[PDB]
Write a protein that binds this ligand. Sequence first.
Ligand SMILES: Nc1ncnc2c1ncn2[C@@H]1O[C@H](COP(=O)(O)OP(=O)(O)CP(=O)(O)O)[C@@H](O)[C@H]1O
Ligand SMILES: C[S@@+](CC[C@H](N)C(=O)[O-])C[C@H]1O[C@@H](n2cnc3c(N)ncnc32)[C@H](O)[C@@H]1O
Ligand SMILES: [Mg+2]
Ligand SMILES: [Mg+2]
Ligand SMILES: [Mg+2]
Ligand SMILES: [Mg+2]
Ligand SMILES: [Mg+2]
Ligand SMILES: [Mg+2]
Lengths: 400, 400
Amino acid sequence: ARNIVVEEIVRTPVEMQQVELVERKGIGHPDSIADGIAEAVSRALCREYIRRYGVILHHNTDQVEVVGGRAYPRFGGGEVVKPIYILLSGRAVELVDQELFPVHEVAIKAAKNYLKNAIRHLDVENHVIIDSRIGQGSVDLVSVFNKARENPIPLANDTSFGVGYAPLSETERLVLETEKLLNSEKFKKEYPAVGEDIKVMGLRRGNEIDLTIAAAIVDSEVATPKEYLEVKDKIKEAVEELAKEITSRKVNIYVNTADDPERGIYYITVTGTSAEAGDDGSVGRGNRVNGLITPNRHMSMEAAAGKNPVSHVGKIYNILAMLIAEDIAKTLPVEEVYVRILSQIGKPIDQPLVASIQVIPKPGHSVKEFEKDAYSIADEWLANITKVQKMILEDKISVF
Amino acid sequence: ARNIVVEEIVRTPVEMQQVELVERKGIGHPDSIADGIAEAVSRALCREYIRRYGVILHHNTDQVEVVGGRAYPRFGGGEVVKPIYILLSGRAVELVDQELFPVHEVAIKAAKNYLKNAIRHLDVENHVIIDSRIGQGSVDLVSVFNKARENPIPLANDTSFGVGYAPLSETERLVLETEKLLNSEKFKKEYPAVGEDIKVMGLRRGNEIDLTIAAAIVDSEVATPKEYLEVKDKIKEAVEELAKEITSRKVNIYVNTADDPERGIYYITVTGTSAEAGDDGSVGRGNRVNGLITPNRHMSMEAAAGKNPVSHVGKIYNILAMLIAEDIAKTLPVEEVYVRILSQIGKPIDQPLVASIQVIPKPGHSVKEFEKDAYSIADEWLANITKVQKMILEDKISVF
Ligand SMILES: Nc1ncnc2c1ncn2[C@@H]1O[C@H](COP(=O)(O)OP(=O)(O)CP(=O)(O)O)[C@@H](O)[C@H]1O
Ligand SMILES: C[S@@+](CC[C@H](N)C(=O)[O-])C[C@H]1O[C@@H](n2cnc3c(N)ncnc32)[C@H](O)[C@@H]1O
Ligand SMILES: [Mg+2]
Ligand SMILES: [Mg+2]
Ligand SMILES: [Mg+2]
Ligand SMILES: [Mg+2]
Ligand SMILES: [Mg+2]
Ligand SMILES: [Mg+2]
């Protein structure tokens, strides 16, 4: 009864296309900082709503503005001159039965806690000003969310679509795992100088990949330009070892391409994030739920970070489409699968207006052989969409 | 001498796929407000930079946060209780040879002027607080003039990427023209109750299109819920006529699906924008430069609104790719044309690393019959990239 449509599409697989471009904005990137703050605020509000009332109340904190500060990085240790200003926005329930909910206290505390754990060399108390302007949702949009027990499956709060796909190409996996490696605790233990503001661009032309990495180096961990260049080489070497595990194509690796040692220009920072130096961020300006920006693929413009995991489809459908695509790619003979799920505002989220599954079958296979299998996969995920909510609160899935 | 490559691509045309999704956020939509303000601020800064110094100085105002307020909409005329808060962010040159440039005065005045001309029932002076945190750039004019002399066409410092396509499918044209119609001046005088916060979602399933419209209705123009339902029907009728002008497919029109008259839930607003109440906005969260959100196509994540129209290569490339595609589709026999432009480091931006032109020819035609014509089109646009910049500053091209 669910509007699931499985169709064959003709197209050159991404792996066979001549030009493939993939980008990822690391954790310390201002846009990703905004995403992370939005998500941390949302999850904190969920937990606190449950802790106080045993139920999640309406709130979408998918609105964070990172206003870059000013800093003077110096080898051996720089200084921030003007702190980073972060405006928390969005919607949250502040009035609960005439009692006041600590919206701003929870949001600001969650934002700060995320920055403390995400950016290691960022002094949150002195390098960051966090203000909260989170408002209260509209009397009507709040009503569809409030239909809890009335609708065991929550109703969709908007008419929006989520887009996912699978499997990842070699270039996509390379870009994704490059950022994850350079921002993993293990790699940080090995090279503390590598900040979190890491931007990875993978550009494949034929069977040759150019992997450009922009990695902010913490100036307190490098005393001289030579130490900085050595940190760059270790980044390169680590990514070389990783690339050999991911693809047999030739991989050219470039680290901080804007550097000009002859002019003393170096990508060093005080805190490890370019947000310190006049670079701005906001929600929905970077990675999709799969952690990548893939113009060779298809994407939804719906941001996932900060949206409640109960009713907002921009987050739920982007996650579900990705998971449906992954399961199809993992179990059925498909070269590629793209999933698009469209909500109708005021319809249960398990009854999308359409769940489009476009498949490129592997050579020798026809879609009629497994179309019902793909149908069942999407139907089961849509029938268990509520599980995605738990996956968010239990920190089992990332949204950027 | 330009690396323009015209290739044939074999793939299911969008018009031929079973499921197509298209979305457009009208001018009054909070995200579109942020985009519109971002671009309006940028254009105001450009004009004022030129008026004072005869040259545009660096600036990026692609950071605007529309914080929803609070309102009590009532049939016959409601009231705003908490004004909308808009934060202008980004960076701009405020010190020009140590003399002060009115960055914030220009920006806030431009944001207000854009709102006054965009949302007709919005009292900007009492319903909106606009504050600016745009950062300070310092420039010595001798340097900007010297980097002209040296390079008339700016050189690319990074690998930037633009994507365009043409022609628009019937569903894309239907979504686009629906928003344009309902937000046209003629329709506004005929139905003043229809606000500017108009979001159109088009779903094509085979040869049946479901067209969902979310239109904020001005509560001062509808005296009773019945008049509100009547306005909805008038929208439906106008779009029915428009649909018959575009396609011979079955078109189902749905307007404000969240309404629940039995519980008094209505999409009425005081100002004609949901920014007054339960929706927030930020830049780069909605339409692409072609005015649409198209998951069946290849979109860029890059926000174009607010980015400098002379120096930001990603914005001009996305616009140029769109224009190249449109010119190709309107002049040559192609079912579809996808245009991708990649810049080459330290080369002029009119000398891209590659200008990929992928074309699906119409039946009976082959690409080699018209490949040189498509080459010339893209070559001419790349040679007139500066004129395109002028078109942007002269408000002759839209970016959302
Ligand atoms: N010296 C430097 N070298 C390389 N990268 C740097 C850098 N300083 C900052 N960066 C990184 O580049 C980003 C700003 O560069 P830029 O504005 O040209 O990219 P962009 O136009 O694509 C906006 P976005 O970063 O959101 O994609 C910073 O946020 C940071 O991640
Ligand atoms: C549904 S709101 C997003 C949800 C909201 N931000 C929240 O916190 O739940 C997004 C867009 O939908 C439209 N919209 C707002 N209220 C609506 C309603 N009651 N019915 C239909 N569409 C609505 C507006 O154009 C708005 O920009
Ligand atoms: Mg950005
Ligand atoms: Mg939002
Ligand atoms: Mg949305
Ligand atoms: Mg939005
Ligand atoms: Mg750049
Ligand atoms: Mg970028």
